[PDB]
Amino acid sequence: TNLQDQTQQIVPFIRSLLMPTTGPASIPDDTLEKHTLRSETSTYNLTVGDTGSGLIVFFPGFPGSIVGAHYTLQGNGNYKFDQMLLTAQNLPASYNYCRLVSRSLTVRSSTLPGGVYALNGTINAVTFQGSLSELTDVSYNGLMSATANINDKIGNVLVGEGVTVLSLPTSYDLGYVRLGDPIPAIGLDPKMVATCDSSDRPRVYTITAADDYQFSSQYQPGGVTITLFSANIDAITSLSVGGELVFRTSVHGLVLGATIYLIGFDGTTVITRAVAANNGLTTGTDNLMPFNLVIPTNEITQPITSIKLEIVTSKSGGQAGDQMSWSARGSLAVTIHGGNYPGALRPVTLVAYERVATGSVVTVAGVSNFELIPNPELAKNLVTEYGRFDPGAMNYTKLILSERDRLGIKTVWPTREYTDFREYFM
Amino acid sequence: VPFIRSLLMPTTGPASIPDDTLEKHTLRSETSTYNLTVGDTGSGLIVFFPGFPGSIVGAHYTLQGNGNYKFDQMLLTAQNLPASYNYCRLVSRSLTVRSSTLPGGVYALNGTINAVTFQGSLSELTDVSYNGLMSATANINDKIGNVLVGEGVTVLSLPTSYDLGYVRLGDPIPAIGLDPKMVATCDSSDRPRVYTITAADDYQFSSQYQPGGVTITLFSANIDAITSLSVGGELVFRTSVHGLVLGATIYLIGFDGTTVITRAVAANNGLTTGTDNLMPFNLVIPTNEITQPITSIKLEIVTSKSGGQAGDQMSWSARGSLAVTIHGGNYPGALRPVTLVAYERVATGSVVTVAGVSNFELIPNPELAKNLVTEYGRFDPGAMNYTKLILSERDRLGIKTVWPTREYTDFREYFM
């Protein structure tokens, strides 16, 4: 395939929705705003590990320049993070706002490593209607029993034929999200950043960590470490943590220390942020540590599945054999900025492969169709205008999406079936 | 259809928006008039907020004999909307700026007008000068230049988005306290705008001891704010020199560069060596003390060591991230469409006249909802498609946002 950008190719909405490789249109709905169309590609040659198996989490509907992430299944039974898939152009560096019109990806392996003379490999895929940590079984086999819809899952497509991910809409009449763009700033630190993050429709978890949890342990050198909770969260962008815990004690000479851990999908620790240090407890008094954590977007290198609180307690001068004890009563509220905008976390497409030869490649190639608002430096030079009026396009989209089971339009295609559906729709 | 009559001619009256937000409301229309005296250089800037749901129409700035501006006042509406209403929604707005002096001869008085419609907020502009306004947009019909003040400029509010919820105005809720200066309101909160400022990344600071302490500015960053704001986060300090005392102060800086609000965030933090020291940030700033618009934020750090020897070294190391939250910031209209009207060197003793009409979809507070009847919008089919068609053909029909006023009179007679 000889890919070219289609951003000067004017197209109706109904073609650009189902065939996103044609070019961008604008979304016909009640949001009237001056904007700019841009069609953006993404080309990858993913590497096959030593077992032949993997997992390609796709994020269809994401209103920005993240497509997904690739993982390699290790030999012991775990996953290991390879890289996050992106789009071609870094969209925060030139545009403030964004809104996804359509998207289509293509996963295929057909090109025979150097000492190999036969082709091997199969593909299972679904489209799960929740976030990545919400999914209960992420195997190759158990991936299929994730949804009850027939059209949202496909089974044992050969890896040479390939699969095709199609982005069906999560909503309309949506607002433009704010891309995480730098704002002008000067500081004494040369590696100082400041961004304007995506903030409309946030996601808030609340975690009751302890409701009078009694602690009891003996003295040890260096302290005693427990883990107060290990709840699951969902994060591709920035996030903040708030709340408190309230401590009571009857033993003198205790100091406290807490830390927050953010664990990725593959199980490794992504971020360690210290919370308390040299926090001396006083008996007969509700004393407390507050939680004021703000984690920026660039700290996140891979997606995040869980969050964890470890607390290190140690007596100052007991030194031999004595008790240590405290109680905890508090609640904390984790806020994910822009977590409930439909598409940022909600539809998750998983494409897993098996049996593919070691050292072979799995080629992922796609094209995204956005609509944007420029930043102050690019708006001096580029023209924005309202969308071209087309009546009866929204009704025809509602018609197609309502009568979808009999027309056989699916969000996860075999490539040979998507191709002659496309040629019939031509 | 009465909606494009109320949209292209907002002095005619209000009409309800034909979209799918079906809520009981009442239509009200409110005027804003001002006779603006002119400065000693004759020049200045009028920033407009045309899509803004609320009483705030604009802001006035006068340009000094230097290059810097000076805040004059805030252009508001006739009556206060949060004193009698809870929710609000903008239908349309028109705003005329003219010099009401009328020369008695043939050659006119001094002063011309530039007028651009910038598609981002106020602090995102690069050049705010009179010449430098006409770079800020590349659209042919969002800017007009070199228009005489005797003719005038008229500013129109074209939509930024439809299907928008009603926004809560900054209305007083019933509250009692011991301080007679207590103000408790219910601010606009839907669609926040959040900044994240990684201020320090293992930054080191070293200085000689001085009496009183050494003050540095850790960062400065451009943010936009007209209403309630909040700062939260944490800086983390490590040191090895004993006996340091830390104190931080936040700042909010205006469009004229003058400091609006100073809040001492941390005071008398004593550092401990070999541990991990905390300076957590907890600020809420109410709307009632935002006197002018806010353009940037600053953070100053003042460190000092008890003991007092002139050869002493003080040193610490910093890392952290802080987050600034603008409540109701990413609502379309509250900050993003900004119209600037700059007049240069008008004659001394001249009067510049601002006069307009705004049209609303309001919802009354409970003491006045005993007397006002609210009801659903009057249904007309095809108003939305005809609005979409007229705005799709905006370039060929010559519908602008700023213009000369006589061109708008010729447009208005041709449209009626």
Added chain:
Amino acid sequence: TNLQDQTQQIVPFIRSLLMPTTGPASIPDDTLEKHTLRSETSTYNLTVGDTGSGLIVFFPGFPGSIVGAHYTLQGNGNYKFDQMLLTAQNLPASYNYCRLVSRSLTVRSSTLPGGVYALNGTINAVTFQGSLSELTDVSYNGLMSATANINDKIGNVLVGEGVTVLSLPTSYDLGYVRLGDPIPAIGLDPKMVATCDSSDRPRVYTITAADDYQFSSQYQPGGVTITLFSANIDAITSLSVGGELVFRTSVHGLVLGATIYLIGFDGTTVITRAVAANNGLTTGTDNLMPFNLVIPTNEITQPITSIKLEIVTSKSGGQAGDQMSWSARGSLAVTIHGGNYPGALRPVTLVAYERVATGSVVTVAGVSNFELIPNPELAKNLVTEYGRFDPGAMNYTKLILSERDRLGIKTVWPTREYTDFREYFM
């Protein structure tokens, strides 16, 4: 006049060269290169002084955002720098290269203050084929003796009529000019700038400052200051000073210091840079101070007219009325980076106004057409392409400019003669 910005309107080069407010065209020549067409306005309400007189020094042909400079005239016959006349869009912020296509300015004072019944003022205006500090007589009457051509000057134009300035070409087949564009760079100092300068066709002034020059004076406490030379130079953008002076003496214990001044058009010192610091001398041996100066563009707030070198000599062990003496032999060079580009300094138009009523205005309004090359952030999002082919345009331009004394085409027009010429050509 209600100015609008026409860059979306194509035009031939003959209509854009003679009537540059119509729109931008592409220069037909053998410089074949992908570019974008950009046309820019510039509007000013200049303030008249207390005497009513002044001067407007334009720069027709400058390949950048600098149009000119305004100087008011003081009550004691001196001048005083008001401001720089610039283009609306800062072109180095978003473009890297630049050629000028056309330009057309208009000076006019039709409006008058609130109580005044009558309108005063007359204009002289000349086009001078040399640089700014080469002009010998800058008086109101002495402008007319700056050129011998019928069409490069006009006098006694009433200020309510106005004067129009048109830039006829100085050359063709010129390369583009590297604008003073910002660079990606990080440093410790937060107010760090680093630019890529205009450097094609530089200008060199060499100055033999001394040739066995003998100094002798009595001892004053602190030393005496003497001015070794001063010379007329020409600089708007960055320049460099390089060279060396070699000192030789026979009096024990002397301390030398040197400082370089740069003077504006009005006489005030723009830039001071020290060259020698405490620089002790040695008897019986030639010892030397070198010159290594780099002046960036943003240090220069007004056009530079002369350069000066003051040398401060001193004696460490003070004694009442003893002799001090030295000798000098050295030559230093000044390199105005990109000074010899035809248009950047070589033609200058001066528009002097007299007897305008005080407190009134003088209004400068123009249109400048360019051909530019975007920066790496804007070339992601803007289409650039080759110029439009029209044969015989270059020959017709050469014919028009060969017979300009017969056809009556001039650089300095009076207004409404340009209007009836414009309506006849249209």
Added chain:
Amino acid sequence: VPFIRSLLMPTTGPASIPDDTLEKHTLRSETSTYNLTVGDTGSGLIVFFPGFPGSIVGAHYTLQGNGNYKFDQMLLTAQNLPASYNYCRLVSRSLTVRSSTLPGGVYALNGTINAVTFQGSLSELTDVSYNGLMSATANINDKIGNVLVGEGVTVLSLPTSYDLGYVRLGDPIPAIGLDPKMVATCDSSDRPRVYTITAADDYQFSSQYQPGGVTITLFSANIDAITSLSVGGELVFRTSVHGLVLGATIYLIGFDGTTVITRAVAANNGLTTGTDNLMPFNLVIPTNEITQPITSIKLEIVTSKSGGQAGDQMSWSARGSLAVTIHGGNYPGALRPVTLVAYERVATGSVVTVAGVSNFELIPNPELAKNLVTEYGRFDPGAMNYTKLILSERDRLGIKTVWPTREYTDFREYFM
């Protein structure tokens, strides 16, 4: 062979450029061939200079197991042209990147190619990865994606400018010296590129005493060099502490992060209290020390204290600005047009074959000019207008700078 045939098909044979530059010369055609060995990950980056007037074709980089790159070699033409010629112009150039590995079965081997043509230099690219190449331009005839290595890509050189003079090849001049490894050349001088870096604008430094001193990096900036450069300017150091001494070093960093060239700029430079202290910069970097192209530059000041004591204070403050002249840097083709061809994950045991042909107009050195005849160019009127007619209508005819090899083969067949 005419010019318009030699421009679009450079394998045909060389012609001379029809323009107003009449000079006795001789025209020439050179062929360069490189069989390339693919690294362990399988990916890399070939960076072509499609308009370079001399005999430097490109540079191979290899992507490692981490994110880093490694320099392989500078790809060159067949003969070293500065050994035998003085001056040059480039007429045309065409290069071809594919694998000559000819699969036996039905399916092919691993490997794809991206390719873009970027209109600025190499250190001006924001993202240089495989995926991030195809964002670097907006023209659809300057980028292509997922091209198989079995098909391959083809790079064509279209003009950046015409009516440009010759450039001096870096030929050696006759010289004698005591040192046997003495190099003296005459290199490219016309149309320089000058950078101005205000390195410190009243910066202030403060630190404790340490043995060996404290090293701090003053600035870092992205420059461009394939041939010789120089550095000039000063720094004025003000201090207040006795016994200080300074020493600086300028590093030139390659495209892969590796330090290419280090030069001691000043050393054992003592500071005097209360006066200015000048540290002038005078560096000349010849062409032969540059092995891989330079994309960055640093300055690192090592402060120290004479007669030092533990825990003792040392501090200074500096101002100054610097100049960096790249000789022959603003000449069109030396640095400004750059074509990048990135290949990813080619199969194990496969070779990538860079092979092409370049056409020149050359003037010999005086040892070879006594045996070749040099003459004026051939006269063909209308070749320049026909060239302009082809290039002005480039999108309707579909003439690209990067081609698939099969589509350029089809173009070549129906252009014969």
